[PDB]
C-alpha cells in the first residue's frame, strides 16, 4: 500500500513544479512595457519564420481538405435530396467542428514545433545566458516577440485556412458534378452565420494561439542543455499542443 | 526559495484554471388526459402562443389507464382561474407538439387540470369524414 | 583584496558540488584555477554572475555582496564582468559586425559615424578586422572565441571570466589565445581568471595556481612552487601521472569466474 | 569637461569613457578649422570609446592644408594605440 | 535579412483582409428606429427578430414577445423603418406564413408615432379550428 | 534575369531529384537480401515497444474528445429535421470516411513520426551507426528494417482503436447527454454499411498511411546533418512532409472507390 | 610493412579538396601518429582505410589486395580486423555497457555463454572498467566513454586500429589512462595503433612514425624525434605552438582605411 | 520530504473518486423493434414477425412491461396503439390502412 | 527485455477487442422472374417482401428488347415455398421518403414468372384524375 | 552544366502546362411579392433569362415594386406580357414567370399578377 | 554511385507516384420542343417505363418565338421508337430529380408530340378559381 | 587449426592453433580430462588468443574443482605475455 505510493507523489510534485513554472515566466514577460520603438525590427523578424514560414502548409492543405469535404459531403447528399446545397459542410465544418481545430494541429509542426526548436538550440551553445549576461533581461528580448507572434499570426492564419478550403464547393459542385452556382452560393447566403459561427469561430481561434505559444516557448525554454534534451522537448510539444487543441475543444463547443 | 515557491503558484493556476471551467459548463401541476399524442419530457408548454414553462415527466395511472402528465409554470403569472381549458396543438403544421393553455374567464401548488382535451388522430379524421 | 568570493558551499540536489570553497585573485593577474572534468567549474562562474542563487556562505565584490542584491543594482554591477563561453556564445541571426557592436548598443551614446569606427578597431586586437561580414556559422572553433574576445572588450570591464579557452584546438589556435590575454593584463590592465585543465599552457602566463580536489581547496601555490612541493594528490594532476590517489580502476568483487 | 580654444589650439579636460562624448560630437566641426596643435595634459584616463573622438578629429583636419601636432599625452594614448594597430592617425611620442 | 521579410510579411498582412472581404462581403449581411406596441391572442410561430413586412418586403424586425400581466394576452414590439412614416389606423395587421413550413411573418395590408397603439388586428389560424369548421 | 535566375532553380531542381532518389535506395536495401526472422524477431518487439504501445496516451486521451465533439455538432445539425434517432448514422460514417485514419496519421507523424526522427538521426550524430557498419551487418537491415515494419503494423492497429473509441464516445453524448433512446440509436448504426465501403476502405487507406509516414521518419533521421542545429531542422521537417503526404494523399484516394 | 600506403588520394567533395598528393606508409608493429590543423579533413581520412568512402584516383590497398576491387562480402573479412573507434562514443544507448562490449562477438556465434562471460571480464579488466558493467552509458564519463571503446577494440584481436583524435578535451587525470594502455598495447600483442590526434606532447611520447599534414600535403617524414631539428617553418609552427609564422594570424584583410 | 509524498498519493485518488399475441389484415411498413404505446407513453417493443402458412395473415407478437397487469378482454390494438396473463391472444384487432387503397372509396 | 512481451500483447489484444465494437456493435454481426410498366424508384439489392419481413434481394432489373417493357427478378430463400399463383405484386415505399419496396401480398419455383402485375403510380397523372 | 540549363527551361515548362491545364433595366409593380428576394430566376418558358437587382418601395403608397434583368438577345417581348410570379415547389423560390399575351430601357409592365398568399385561400375556399 | 546512380532512381521513382496521379478519371441524339421547362439541368436522366436510358447533354432556347428546346441522349440498344411517343416533364417523388419520361427513329430527328410541365402555383390558381 | 587433444596419461598432448571459432569440439566434449591430469602441455604452438585462454582457464578450474592439482610445463612464453595485460591473479595459471 505504502511502497508503491510513495512513488506515485514524486511525479505529482514535479508535474506541479513543471505547469508552475510555465505561469512563473509568462507572468514575467507579461509587465510594464519598455519604448515600442525599440521591438519594432524585432517583431518583423519573430513574424516571418512564424507566420511567413507557416504559409505554404496552410494554403496547400487547404484546398485538399475543401476538396475532400466537398467529394464526401455529395455521398451522404445523394441519399437525401439536398445534393444542391453543398454551401452545408463546406463551410460550416470549416468554421465549428474543422477550421481552427485542425489548422492548429498543422500550425505545431511547421510553426510549433519549430519554435522551441530555436529557443531550445540556444539553451545548449549558452545564447541566452550570454545575452542575459551583457545588459539586458533575457525574458524580454527572446521569449516576448516570440510571444506575440504566435498569438497574433495564427488568427491571421485561421482565416486562411478558412478562405481557401471554402471554395472547393466551386471546384467540386460547380465545373465537376454540375451543381448550380446560384443554388451554391444563394444557399450559402441564407445560413445564418454573423454571431454562432462567424466572431465565435474568431473567439475560438484566438485562445488557441495561447495555448500553443505557451508550450512551444516553454519545452524549449526548460530543457536539458544536450542535443538529446531539445529532440526530446520537440517530440513533446506536439503532444502537449495535440492535447490541449482537441483537449479544449470539447469543452468550449459546448458554449454554442 | 524557489522549490517552495514553484508549489504553490502551480496549485493556485489550476485552481484558477478549474474555476474557469465550472464556469465554462453552464411550482408544479397535474394534468390527467386520454391521448396525449406526440408530446415528450422538456415539451414547450403555452398560453397565447407565447411559453411560460416545460413539463417534467410523463407518467401513467396504474389503476384508470389515463396518461398523466406533470408540467412547471413560474412565479411571473400566478393569477390563473380555475375554470381553464388544455388543447393538444402542434407548432406549425407538422412539427414538434406543445400543449396551449386555454385560459377562461385560486392556483396553489398542487391542483390538477380540470378540461382536458383529447389529442389529434389521424385514424378518426380519416373515418369521421369518411363514414 | 579580495574580490570574488569568500565561502561557497552550494549544493544543487542531492550531489555535492561545492564544499567550503575559498578563492583569492588579485587586481590585474593571471589566476590559474584547474580542475578535472566533472567537478563544478560551470556553476562556478555562474555564482559571480547571478544566475543561479548560493545556498550558504556569502558572494562579496568590491565592497558587495552578490546573493543579498535585487535585480536592480546587479544588472548594473553586471557590465564589469563579460563572460566568455567554452561553445558559440554569439548569436546566429546577426553578423559578426553586429554581433560584437551588440552590447554596446544597449546604451547608445556613440552616433552613427562614430558607431562604426569603435567595433572595427576592436577587430584589429583579436585579428578579425576584415571578418567584419561573414556569418557566424561559418567560423571555426578557434575564430568564434576570438569574435567573442572583442565582444568581452566592448565596455571595458574589470573582471573577465572565461569558461574552458582553448580545451579542445590546436597548439597553433592554442599559441593564439595566449597571446592575446597577456597583451590585455599588460596594456589595458584588466583582471582576466583562466579555468582550463591544460597543465602546459595555463601555467605559462599564471601569477596565482588553485588546484581543485575533494571539491575543496588543497593548494594555493603560484606558478614556481608548485612544481617543486611535496604532494601526491597535486603532482597527480601534474604533467600526466597515472597511478597515484586515483586507483583508475572500479571497486569489483571477487574476480572468479562461473 | 571643456574645449576652449587659445586661438591656434585646444585643450581637452575631464574624462571620455563613452557617454560626455555627446556635447562635443555636435560641434566637432567648427573646434578643428583653426587648430594646430591637441592638449591632452589635464586628462585622467582613455578607453577605446573614447579614443574614437580623437580619431574622428584628424579625418577632416588634415584635408584643408595643415598638419597637426600633440604635445603632453601621457602613455596611456601610446599603450592602447599598440593594442589595436593605429600607424599614423594617432602620433606616437 | 531585413528587405527580405519585410517584403513577404505585407503579402501576409493582405491576405488577413483578403480573407475577412472572402467572409463579410460573401456569407454575412454585413458591410434611429421607433417602438409600436401590438396585442394578439394566438400569434402563432412569432418568435423573435420576425420580418416586419407590408407587401412582401421587409421593413424592419422585433425584439421579444412579452405576456400582459393583467388580462393575460400576448403582446409584441414592431420595429419598422424611419423611411416610412405614412401609416394611418385603417391599416390592419395579418399574421402569415411564407409557404406552407415558412417562417410566420407578420403582414401590413392620424399618422402613428412613437408611443402610438392599433386597435384591430388579426391573430394567426390555428389547425384545429379549420379542420372543425371544415367538418361542421 | 532570364540566365542567372534560371541557373539556381534548376540546380534546386537536381537537389530535389537526388533528395528523392535517395529516398528510395534506402527503402529498397532494407527490404530485400537474406530476410532471416532469427535476428531481427527480437528486435521486432524491440521496436514495437517505442512506437506502437508507447502511443497509447494519444488514443485513451483523446478520442473521447472527437468522439463528442462529433456527437455534439452532430446533434445540432440533425435538429429541425427531427432525425436524433439518425445520430448513429452521422457518428459511425464520418469516423470511416473522413476522420479516422486521416487523422491518427497525422497524430502517428506528430508522436511516433517525429521519435523516429530523433532516434536514428541522434545515433549518427554520436558515430553509431558507422561504428556498427564495419564491425556486423551494415545498419540498414539492423536499425532500420525493424524500424520500418514497427510502423507498418501499428497504424492499421491504433486506428481501429481510434474508431472505436469515437464511436463509445458518440454513444456517450448520445444516450447518456442528450436522451434519446439506446434501441434505435445502436439500430441506426445496424442500418448503416459496415462491409465493401467503410470497414474495408478504411483499412487499406490506413495501410497505405503507414507507409508514406514512415518512410519520410526513416529518411530525414538517416540523410542528415551530423551537427546538432540539422537535428531539430530535421526533426521539425518530418511533421510538414507527412502532412503534405497524408492530406495530399487523401483528395486522390477519395476520388476513387467513392462515388 | 606497407599495410595502406595511401598512393595519391584525392577525396574531392564539392568545389572544395581535402587532399592533393599524401602519400605515406604504415609499418608493421608499430604506432603510425599523423598529425594536423584542425578544420582540415581528420576524420574523412581514417574512413578511406576502412572503406566506407572511395577516393577519386586512389591506391589504398589492405596486404595486396584493392579496396575499391572489393566486392560487400570482400569488404566484410577485413573490416572485423580494423575495430574502429570514434571520439563521440562508438557504444550503443539500448542496452547495458556489458553487452556493448559484447555485441561483436555475440552475432559470430561461435562462443558459448560459459566462454562467453569470460572474455568479456577479461576485456574491461585491461581498460579497469569490470566492476562497473552494470550500468547505462548515459551515465557515463567523457575519458571513461573511450576506454569502454577500447576493451571493444580488442575483441576481434585486429591488426591496425584507428584512434579517431583521443583525449582530445579530456583531463590529464584521464588523460594518462588513455596514453598508458596503447604504449602497453604494442609490448605485448603487437597491433599497429593509428592515431590522428593533434596534443603534440601526448602524440609523440608513443609513436615513432609521425606525418605532420599541413596544406593537404605530408611535409614531414621524419621520426618522433628527427622533426623537433626540422627547420621548415611549417614543421616549426605545429610542434612548438606558436602565435605568427607562416599563417596570417589575422586575416586575409584588406585596406585599413574607409572604416575608421 | 517523505510525509508530505504518501498523502499527496490518496489526494490524487481523491481527485478522481409477459408476451401476448396478435393478428392483423394489413401491417403496412412494420419494423423490428416498432413501440406499443398505452396512450402515447411507450411501455414495450415487438420481437417476432411472421406469417400463417394457411391463411397468409402477418401475425404481431408483443411485449408489455410486468407493471401493467390490469388488461381487459375489450383492448384493441390498432396501427401501435392499444384501446390478459402471459400466452394471451388478441382477437379484436384493426390493421393499418395503406394509402392506395383509401383513396380509390375516394374517387368511386 | 521482459516487461516489452507484455506491453506488446496488451497492445495486440487492445487492437482486437477494438476491432469488436466496430462489429458486434456495428452492422458486422430460388430465383423468380416478374415485369411491370412503371417501376418508380427501385434499384439493385433492394429488400423484396411479403408484407414488411424480408426475404431476399433483386439482382438486376432489365428491360425487353422488343415492346421495352422492364423485367423485374428476385431471389427468394427455400423457407418460404408455398406461394399460390395468383398473388400480386405491388410497389410502394417505407413511409414518406424511405426506399421503395416490393410489397407481395399472398408453387412458383425456379424459371416461373409471376403473371399479375400492379405498377406504382406517379404524382403527376393522379391528379388527373383526382381532379377531373 | 549545360544539361542543367535544359531541365530548367523543364521545370518551367512543366509548371506553365499544368497551369494551362450588355443587359437593359425594366421595371414592375406588384402588391404583395411573397419570398421574393435578390437573384431570383426571371423566365418565359423555364429557361432563365435574367434575374433581379433589388426590391424597392415607395414610401407613401407602399407598393413593391421590381427591378428586374432581361438580356440584350432577348428583345421581341412586348408590354402585355402578364408577370405572374409563380412558386417554385413548396421551397418559397417565387421565381418571375412572365407569360406574353417592346419592353425595352425603362419600361413598366402593365399585366403584373402578385403573388396571392395562402392565407386568405384558406379563409375563401372554407367560407 | 554518389551521384550518377541517385538520378534515374529519382525520375524512376516520380514516374510511378505522378502517373497514379492522372489514373483517377473515375450515342445518338435526339430533338425535341417544349413550352415550360422547370428545374431540368445538365446530365439530366431521359427514362422509358422509369428506368433510366441516357442523359441529358444541353439546354438552349429558340430565339424566334422563345419556346425551349432540349437534347437528348439515348443508347444504341433501344432503336424501335415512334413517332406516338410523347415527353411529359415528371418529378421522382415528391420534390426529387427532374427527369424525362419516355412513354424507328435515328440520329438527327425530331418529335412533335410533347406535354409541358405545370407548375403547381398556377395549379392552385386553376383550384380557387 | 588441427586441434588434436589424445590422452596419453596426464599429458592432454594439447596441439592446434584455436582463437574463437573451432572451440565447439573441445567444450561440448570435456568431461573426459578433468579426473586424473596433473601436467597440461603446450609446447607444440603457434600463437593463442584470450578465446582459447578462456577454455583454457575454464579447464585448469575443472581439473581443480576435483581437485588432485594442476601443474604446467612446457607452455609458451605467450601465455604469461598478456597476463599482465589482463591483470590475472595467483592460483589461475602455475608457472613454477
Ligand atoms: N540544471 C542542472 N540540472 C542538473 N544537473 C545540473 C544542472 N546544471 C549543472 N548540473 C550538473 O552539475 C555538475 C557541474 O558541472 P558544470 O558546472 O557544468 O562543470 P563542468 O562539468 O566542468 N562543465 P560540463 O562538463 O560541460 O558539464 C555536472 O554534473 C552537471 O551535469
Ligand atoms: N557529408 C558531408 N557533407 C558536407 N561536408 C562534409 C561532409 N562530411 C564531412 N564534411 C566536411 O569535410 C571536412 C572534414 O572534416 P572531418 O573529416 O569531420 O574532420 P574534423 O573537422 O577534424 N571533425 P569535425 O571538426 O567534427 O568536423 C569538414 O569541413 C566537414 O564539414
Ligand atoms: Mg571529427
Same mark, same amino acid.
Given at each position: 500500500l505504502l511502497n508503491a505510493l510513495a512513488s506515485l507523489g514524486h511525479k505529482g510534485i514535479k508535474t506541479l513544479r513543471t505547469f508552475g513554472r510555465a505561469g512563473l515566466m509568462l507572468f514575467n514577460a507579461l509587465v510594464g512595457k519598455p519604448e515600442f520603438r525599440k521591438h519594432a525590427p524585432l517583431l518583423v523578424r519573430q513574424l516571418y519564420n512564424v507566420g511567413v514560414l507557416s504559409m505554404l502548409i496552410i494554403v496547400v492543405s487547404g484546398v485538399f481538405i475543401g476538396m475532400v469535404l466537398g467529394l464526401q459531403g455529395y455521398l451522404v447528399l445523394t441519399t437525401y435530396s439536398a445534393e444542391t446545397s453543398?454551401?452545408?459542410?463546406?463551410?460550416?465544418?470549416? %468554421? !465549428?467542428?474543422?477550421?481552427?481545430?485542425? @489548422?492548429?494541429?498543422?500550425? @505545431?509542426?511547421?510553426?510549433?514545433?519549430?519554435?522551441?526548436?530555436?529557443?531550445?538550440?540556444? !539553451?545548449?551553445?549558452?545564447?541566452?545566458?550570454?545575452?542575459?549576461?551583457?545588459?539586458?533581461?533575457?525574458?524580454? !528580448?527572446?521569449?516576448?516577440?516570440?510571444?506575440?507572434?504566435?498569438?497574433?499570426? %495564427?488568427?491571421?492564419?485561421?482565416?486562411?485556412?478558412? @478562405?481557401?478550403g471554402i471554395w472547393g464547393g466551386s471546384l467540386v459542385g460547380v465545373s465537376w458534378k454540375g451543381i448550380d452556382s446560384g443554388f451554391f452560393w444563394s444557399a450559402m447566403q441564407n445560413a445564418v452565420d454573423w454571431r454562432m459561427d462567424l466572431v465565435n469561430c474568431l473567439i475560438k481561434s484566438v485562445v488557441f494561439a495561447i495555448t500553443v505559444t505557451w508550450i512551444s516557448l516553454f519545452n524549449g525554454y526548460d530543457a536539458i542543455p544536450t542535443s538529446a534534451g531539445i529532440s526530446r522537448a520537440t517530440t513533446r510539444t506536439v503532444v502537449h499542443s495535440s492535447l490541449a487543441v482537441l483537449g479544449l475543444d470539447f469543452v468550449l463547443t459546448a458554449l454554442m | 526559495q524557489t522549490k517552495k515557491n514553484e508549489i504553490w503558484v502551480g496549485i493556485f493556476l489550476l485552481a484558477a484554471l478549474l474555476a474557469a471551467l465550472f464556469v465554462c459548463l453552464k411550482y408544479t401541476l397535474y394534468a390527467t388526459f386520454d391521448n396525449i399524442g406526440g408530446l415528450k419530457a422538456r415539451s414547450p408548454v403555452s398560453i397565447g402562443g407565447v411559453v411560460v414553462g416545460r413539463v417534467a415527466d410523463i407518467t401513467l395511472d396504474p389503476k384508470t389507464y389515463l396518461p398523466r402528465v406533470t408540467l412547471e409554470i413560474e412565479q411571473r403569472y400566478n393569477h390563473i382561474p380555475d375554470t381553464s381549458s388544455l388543447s393538444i396543438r402542434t407548432s406549425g403544421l407538422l412539427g414538434e407538439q406543445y400543449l396551449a393553455l386555454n385560459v377562461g374567464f385560486i392556483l396553489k401548488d398542487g391542483d390538477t387540470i380540470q378540461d382536458t382535451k383529447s389529442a389529434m388522430v389521424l385514424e378518426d379524421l380519416i373515418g369521421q369524414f369518411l363514414y | 583584496n579580495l574580490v570574488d568570493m569568500r565561502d561557497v558551499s552550494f549544493t544543487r540536489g542531492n550531489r555535492c558540488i561545492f564544499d567550503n570553497i575559498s578563492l583569492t585573485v588579485p587586481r590585474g593577474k593571471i589566476t590559474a584555477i584547474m580542475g578535472p572534468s566533472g567537478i563544478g567549474? &560551470?556553476?562556478?562562474?555562474?555564482?559571480?554572475?547571478? *544566475?543561479?542563487?548560493?545556498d550558504h556562505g556569502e558572494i562579496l565584490f568590491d565592497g558587495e555582496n552578490i546573493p543579498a542584491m535585487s535585480r536592480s543594482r546587479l544588472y548594473t554591477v553586471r557590465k564589469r564582468m563579460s563572460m566568455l563561453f567554452q561553445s558559440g556564445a554569439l548569436f546566429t541571426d546577426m553578423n559578426v559586425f553586429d554581433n560584437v557592436a551588440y552590447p554596446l548598443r544597449e546604451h547608445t551614446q556613440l552616433p552613427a559615424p562614430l558607431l562604426h569606427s569603435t567595433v572595427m578597431m576592436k577587430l584589429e586586437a583579436v585579428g578579425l578586422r576584415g571578418a567584419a561580414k561573414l556569418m557566424p556559422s561559418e567560423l571555426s572553433g578557434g575564430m568564434?572565441?576570438?569574435?567573442?574576445?572583442?565582444?568581452?572588450?566592448?565596455?571595458?570591464?574589470?573582471?573577465? $571570466?572565461?569558461?574552458?579557452?582553448?580545451?579542445? *584546438?590546436?597548439?597553433? &589556435? $592554442?599559441?593564439?589565445?595566449?597571446?592575446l590575454i597577456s597583451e590585455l593584463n599588460s596594456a589595458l590592465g584588466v583582471t582576466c581568471?583562466?579555468?582550463?585543465?591544460?597543465?602546459?599552457?595555463?601555467?605559462?602566463?599564471?601569477?596565482?595556481?588553485?588546484?581543485?580536489?575533494?571539491?575543496?581547496?588543497?593548494?594555493?601555490?603560484?606558478?614556481?612552487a608548485l612544481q617543486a612541493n611535496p604532494d601526491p594528490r597535486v603532482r597527480q594532476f601534474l604533467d600526466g601521472i597515472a597511478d597515484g590517489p586515483v586507483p583508475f580502476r572500479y571497486p569489483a568483487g571477487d574476480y572468479h569466474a562461473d | 569637461?571643456?574645449?576652449?580654444?587659445?586661438?591656434?589650439?585646444?585643450?581637452?579636460?575631464?574624462?571620455?569613457?563613452?557617454?560626455?562624448?555627446?556635447?562635443?560630437?555636435?560641434?566637432?566641426?567648427?573646434?578643428? =578649422?583653426?587648430?594646430?596643435?591637441?592638449?591632452?595634459?589635464?586628462?585622467?584616463?582613455?578607453?577605446?570609446?573614447?579614443?574614437?573622438? +580623437?580619431?574622428?578629429?584628424?579625418?577632416?583636419?588634415? =584635408?584643408?592644408?595643415?598638419?597637426?601636432?600633440?604635445?603632453?599625452?601621457?602613455? =596611456?594614448?601610446?599603450?592602447?594605440?599598440? +593594442?589595436?594597430?593605429?600607424?599614423?592617425?594617432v602620433l606616437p611620442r
Open positions: 453543398l454551401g452545408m459542410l463546406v463551410a460550416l465544418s470549416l %468554421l !465549428r467542428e474543422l477550421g481552427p481545430v485542425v @489548422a492548429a494541429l498543422l500550425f @505545431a509542426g511547421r510553426a510549433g514545433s519549430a519554435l522551441t526548436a530555436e529557443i531550445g538550440l540556444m !539553451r545548449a551553445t549558452e545564447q541566452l545566458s550570454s545575452m542575459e549576461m551583457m545588459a539586458v533581461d533575457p525574458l524580454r !528580448r527572446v521569449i516576448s516577440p516570440r510571444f506575440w507572434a504566435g498569438v497574433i499570426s %495564427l488568427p491571421l492564419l485561421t482565416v486562411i485556412f478558412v @478562405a481557401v | - | 567549474k &560551470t556553476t562556478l562562474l555562474r555564482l559571480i554572475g547571478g *544566475q543561479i542563487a548560493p568564434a572565441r576570438r569574435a567573442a574576445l572583442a565582444r568581452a572588450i566592448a565596455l571595458e570591464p574589470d573582471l573577465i $571570466m572565461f569558461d574552458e579557452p582553448f580545451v579542445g *584546438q590546436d597548439p597553433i &589556435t $592554442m599559441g593564439v589565445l595566449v597571446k581568471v583562466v579555468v582550463s585543465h591544460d597543465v602546459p599552457e595555463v601555467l605559462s602566463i599564471a601569477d596565482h595556481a588553485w588546484i581543485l580536489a575533494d571539491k575543496k581547496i588543497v593548494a594555493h601555490g603560484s606558478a614556481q | 569637461l571643456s574645449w576652449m580654444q587659445t586661438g591656434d589650439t585646444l585643450a581637452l579636460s575631464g574624462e571620455l569613457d563613452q557617454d560626455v562624448l555627446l556635447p562635443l560630437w555636435e560641434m566637432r566641426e567648427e573646434a578643428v =578649422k583653426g587648430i594646430t596643435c591637441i592638449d591632452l595634459s589635464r586628462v585622467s584616463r582613455v578607453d577605446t570609446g573614447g579614443l574614437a573622438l +580623437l580619431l574622428h578629429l584628424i579625418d577632416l583636419a588634415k =584635408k584643408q592644408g595643415n598638419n597637426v601636432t600633440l604635445q603632453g599625452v601621457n602613455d =596611456k594614448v601610446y599603450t592602447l594605440a599598440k +593594442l589595436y594597430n593605429l600607424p599614423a592617425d
